[PDB]
Amino acid sequence: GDLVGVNKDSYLILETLPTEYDSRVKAMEVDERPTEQYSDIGGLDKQIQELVEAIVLPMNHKEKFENLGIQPPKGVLMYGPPGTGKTLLARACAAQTKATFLKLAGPQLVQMFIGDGAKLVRDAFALAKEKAPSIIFIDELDAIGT
Amino acid sequence: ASKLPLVTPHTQCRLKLLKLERIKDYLLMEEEFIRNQEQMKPLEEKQEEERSKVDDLRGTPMSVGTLEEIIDDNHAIVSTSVGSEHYVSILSFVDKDLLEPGCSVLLNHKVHAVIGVLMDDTDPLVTVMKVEKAPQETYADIGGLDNQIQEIKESVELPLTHPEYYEEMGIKPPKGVILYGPPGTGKTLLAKAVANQTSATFLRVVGSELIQKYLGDGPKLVRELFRVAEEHAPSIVFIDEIDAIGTKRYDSNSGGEREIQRTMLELLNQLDGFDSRGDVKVIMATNRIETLDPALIRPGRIDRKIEFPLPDEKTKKRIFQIHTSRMTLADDVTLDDLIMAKDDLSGADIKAICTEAGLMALRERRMKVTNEDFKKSKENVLYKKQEGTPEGL
Amino acid sequence: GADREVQRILLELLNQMDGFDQNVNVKVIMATNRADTLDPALLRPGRLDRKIEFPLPDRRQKRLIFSTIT
Amino acid sequence: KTYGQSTYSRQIKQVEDDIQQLLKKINELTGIKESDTGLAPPALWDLAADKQTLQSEQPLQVARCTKIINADSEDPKYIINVKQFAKFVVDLSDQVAPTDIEEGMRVGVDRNKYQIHIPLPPKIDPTVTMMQVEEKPDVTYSDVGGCKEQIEKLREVVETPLLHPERFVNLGIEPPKGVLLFGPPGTGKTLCARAVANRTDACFIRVIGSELVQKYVGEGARMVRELFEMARTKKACLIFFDEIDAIGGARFDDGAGGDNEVQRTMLELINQLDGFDPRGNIKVLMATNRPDTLDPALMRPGRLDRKIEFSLPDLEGRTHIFKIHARSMSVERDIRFELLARLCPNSTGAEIRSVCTEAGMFAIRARRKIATEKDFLEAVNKVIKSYAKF
Amino acid sequence: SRRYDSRTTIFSPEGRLYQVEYAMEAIGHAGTCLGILANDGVLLAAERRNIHKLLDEVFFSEKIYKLNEDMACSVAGITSDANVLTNELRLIAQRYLLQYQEPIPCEQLVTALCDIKQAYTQFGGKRPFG
Amino acid sequence: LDKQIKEIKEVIELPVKHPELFEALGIAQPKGVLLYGPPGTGKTLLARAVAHHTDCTFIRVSGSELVQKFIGEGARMVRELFVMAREHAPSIIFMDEIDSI
């Protein structure tokens, strides 16, 4: 399954190439690194504590979890009436963490052809795995999670 | 032929005579010059061999591609049959007024430069929708409408026939007309008559044909119906039986009601929206106008609203004569006796009466229709009433 | 386009099955759990003509199946 | 003959006929026969017979469209995907600088060594590229009568922040980026939209809600994404969603799936308007008749910050509308437009325009060339009263 | 509860009582009943809709009911509803006889029953007698 | 099938056997008829009987057959059907399963 450049006529392998990901999956990555401090979110202290302690803390202080012998939480879902500060907290987490961030949207994964959506999902997770510790944010989850 | 735009008063005037006399003088000069120069030297050989150079430039095996995008600098992206796309040069002998995305271009075999464009089929939906000359008949058959005929003419015919009247006052013609009346009064008949008597591409669509089974196809059908109505110069789009697609638009509904509402919204936008509608006239007919959408029949959308009443006393005689014209009758027919009853009879009912009378005469083998035959046919036709007697009265 | 190609396959199958001279011992057997969904062209005579049903065993068939399996 | 249209009518007709005949004679003498191969006129087989087609086929080679996928190392090494042909690892040409080529853009490549020669514009759906306005309407704010506060709010949402940006940065204000227009039919929502399109010195993209509804799953969302990417390409660009209620219906998923695809299109629109990524310099209008059916997420501030209400005009606004619509008409010197505005009870600008047109047509019917106050009164009686049931 | 109410006694947009219209359409299918008035008598002829080899013959008739010493009636529609109305007819006729000691005139008996039916179509929220 | 026989007589046989009553009444002759009912109820038999009794060719076609593979095969078949029916002066076309098309 690797990707290799070969001679046009001799068909001899000459160079091993970087993996290939869909253009959409590549666009899913964050390069501008938003700038929103936790202080810019008011009214949410328990929720911010939960999100940071579930996402950021395992990446930095993995020693605490390894010593206590407990696996870190797997996944955080944010729900509430519109305008309650969910995408804002996601942006704040992306700004404050320096690990790879993969922004994603629910409707972004629904595709015309059959199998393309699953292909996109698995490619996105593959890219996240390749690029060190990473965070995947799936906004508008209700588009596909019905 | 790309002649000067007079744009003088545009009404018969001395300034418009002078600008027009000048054009004629210049054209006379050009004609005399070309004639004399042709006599002096034919120049036919010079005109030829330029075509030979062109044919040399465009090789023998010209390939048919599909233009995808014009970079607007005599360059283009053209897709070959296999599916590949090339960035080529639009040569100077190709009529660029024909180039548009999706056109069938002729490509050079080796260099793939655009060297021509091919004509394309003429049936997006035109053959399916256009009615040609209405088979029914001309204005002669319609009897007893008169004022409605005049209103329809003032709406659709007069703007194309005498536009100076409108241009003088500066008013644009009324936008559209909606024909409403009880079932069987002549809405479709008048529409067909104007279609056959007019000089513009006439398109007919029944509202039930806009209820498609796949999401978005109703909106796409209306969009394309109005798309091939500006492509065909003056046109008249007659959406018969609008009541199927247009309705009070109650939000609390589920199923295909939402899709019908979306189709209606697209039709609304086409009738009056951000873009100018060009030169297209809309006619609509509906047995049931009270259930339509105020947004659908608001003034700016539909200006004129024509009422079609049931024939009363003499229109009935006229329809009877018209439908019995090509039918031999015995000299005992009391057509007045037939019509005298106040039976709310409709023109369609009269036509059915005549046809059934003829049919039963044929069944009995007779050579002429009789008054008793007409009476029995009328009784049979009026047998289709139903409903409850005491209820409602 | 996908459905069009599938319909092309079906039409070619029908054409081939009708293109028999009744002098070649080439027989076609076809098993389908959903015989209602089939296009009637297949059941048209000259094409598939023998419809054999394989119903759930009754008492006697159940007895015979039990005996032959045990 | 006719009743007499003008003393010069016969002369005009004769001169027009002579012009047509002379044009026919010139065409016949010069040839210019139609060609089925799409050849321009011989007078415009110009540089095409030779002298630029030759010098365009000789030096100008043929490049092939490809899409860059990856750039390897600092040293230029590009992976490209020639459509339906192959994929290569290719180098640049001496003419194109490395900064010009980025990941994901379309590049033309020569047929021999497959090296990049020219970047190309991004591929865009025809159905989304045709939404751009190109040619703007001729309407102006002066043609909208009876709406002063509404137009002021609409301007300060869509016009002033673009025209005088420093005025808001100086005071540290982030002006609203979206507005919703709602009211009874015929009040002037699309008219104000046309005025905004005309006045704006920026991209204006017109989107009709029914267009986003598509047969195949995941198509409205793709169109919305492409539209917003095209908008971001521009320095500042206005998007106008007319009849947004077509796809903005409230989320009501329950039991059997209902309008799930349209809801997904709506969700993508919401995400683009406000989401993780920062929306560009994109100001958004929306006009609708039933604001109730819109979803809370779409009607939330940050997506539709301002909600302008359009209502039937007052007596003064009706007078102004009457004047506006009678401006380009052949009318008498003194017509009491105030009297007409009073005589028409609560009614819309569409009704007033219909009244003006019907007065003109009553004149044309009576074979007059000047609409009279009596004609206007008859038009009012016909439109406002007789059609009062509609 | 408003949600489950059928609203059986309201007017339609075109001023029609749909429940009465449907009920009449129900009678349109029942067995045929025929009545002829002669100079020296009256008669009723009814299609005996029930016909089966196993049905027994009980009572003096299946659709012809005696209301008085000088009256009778036939019914077409819901059989159970007919039994309710025939009983009411017998009660009305005997109440008149008790009051006046004279048999009820036929027109008055019909009016009394029709008054009961009219009330059902106006108020009560109940279905009409089909 | 006697009722249908009488009806089809009046409908089809009259125009062909006696094409003068229609001319002298002015009522145009029917261009054809439609038959419908449950599957296998005598439609094709009745069509054959009418064709035999009016002494005309009995060209037959089916909608399923008209639904063919080659692009334009159906149009070509219809055109050939009508041209050959015209060639055979007295003719009766019996498109069988027209519902499909």
Ligand SMILES: Nc1ncnc2c1ncn2[C@@H]1O[C@H](COP(=O)(O)OP(=O)(O)OP(=O)(O)O)[C@@H](O)[C@H]1O
């Ligand atoms: N608790 C909060 N403190 C500060 N700002 C807030 C808060 N909640 C919302 N906001 C403001 O809301 C605006 C938009 O909110 P955002 O879109 O992030 O919310 P959301 O909960 O993700 O929305 P939705 O449910 O509509 O997707 C941001 O400008 C943010 O400033």
Ligand SMILES: Nc1ncnc2c1ncn2[C@@H]1O[C@H](COP(=O)(O)OP(=O)(O)OP(=O)(O)O)[C@@H](O)[C@H]1O
């Ligand atoms: N005034 C009339 N003169 C002549 N024929 C008439 C007249 N009114 C009705 N008809 C006959 O009625 C027949 C039915 O078609 P018509 O156009 O009249 O229907 P319509 O009024 O549009 O009805 P619907 O509302 O059901 O569409 C026509 O063939 C025409 O022959």
Ligand SMILES: Nc1ncnc2c1ncn2[C@@H]1O[C@H](COP(=O)(O)OP(=O)(O)OP(=O)(O)O)[C@@H](O)[C@H]1O
């Ligand atoms: N205030 C106004 N001044 C001038 N003309 C007006 C005014 N309001 C409406 N009109 C007229 O109404 C016509 C109808 O377009 P308008 O923009 O009013 O529709 P709308 O309110 O958007 O309708 P819809 O509810 O059907 O989408 C416009 O062409 C304009 O001529």
Ligand SMILES: [Mg+2]
């Ligand atoms: Mg959010």
Ligand SMILES: [Mg+2]
């Ligand atoms: Mg009609």
Ligand SMILES: [Mg+2]
């Ligand atoms: Mg509008």
